[model samples]
Target: TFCGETCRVIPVCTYSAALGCTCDDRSDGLCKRNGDP
Candidate 1:
């Protein structure tokens, strides 16, 4: 997993201006919501 990268998806709360989000280091090196599924 890559810990020094950024990833984004969708365009709502998942992606918006100042909507806020937390990117977690996934097993596949992809950014996902931490503690969310």
Candidate 2:
């Protein structure tokens, strides 16, 4: 997650039923899903 200047930009891996993707951040970890609830 983006923790201002303290958190490092970690790589993320996303997988689907037929494919996968790589990102520099978490899709759900950054509140993209359910707003980090």
Candidate 3:
């Protein structure tokens, strides 16, 4: 998957950390679960 190119700068979906894409995508500016930092 494009977790670096596509998901780059992406953070936790505020929900993906809790569950899985519960909230809207990019609504939280990427999911932190991916450790994009």
Candidate 4:
């Protein structure tokens, strides 16, 4: 996962034909909180 403010430059989430809603940093990178979904 990104450690500093550079997170904005990095893609935390992405969509692909092989995997939908893929998270680059971690499994829950897109969903930060419990109520996100």
Task: State every prediction's TM-score relative to the real structure.
Answer: 0.21, 0.16, 0.17, 0.16
Give the whole-model CA lDDT for all candidates, comma-separated. Answer: 0.36, 0.27, 0.34, 0.30
Best model per lDDT: 1
Deviation of model 1 at 32, angstroms? 4.3
Clashing residue pairs in candidate 3 are 11-30, 11-31, 11-32, 12-30, 12-31, 12-32
As for lDDT, the candidate ahead, 1 or 2, is 1
Which ten contiguous residues of candidate 3 have the minimum total lDDT? 1-10
Candidate 4 per-residue lDDT over residues 1-37, each given as its tens digit: 2222211235443322122333344323431211221
- lDDT (Cα, tens digit) per residue for candidate 2, span 1-37: 2322211254332322113232234423331121221
- Weakest lDDT window of 10 consecutive positions for candidate 4: 28-37
Error of 3 at 34 (Å): 11
What's the lDDT for candidate 2? Answer: 0.27
lDDT of 3 by residue, 14-35 (tens): 4344433322246343333333
List the candidates ranked by lDDT, beginning with the highest.
1, 3, 4, 2
Please report the candidate that would top TM-score against the real structure.
1
Judging by TM-score, tell me the better candidate of 3 and 4: 3
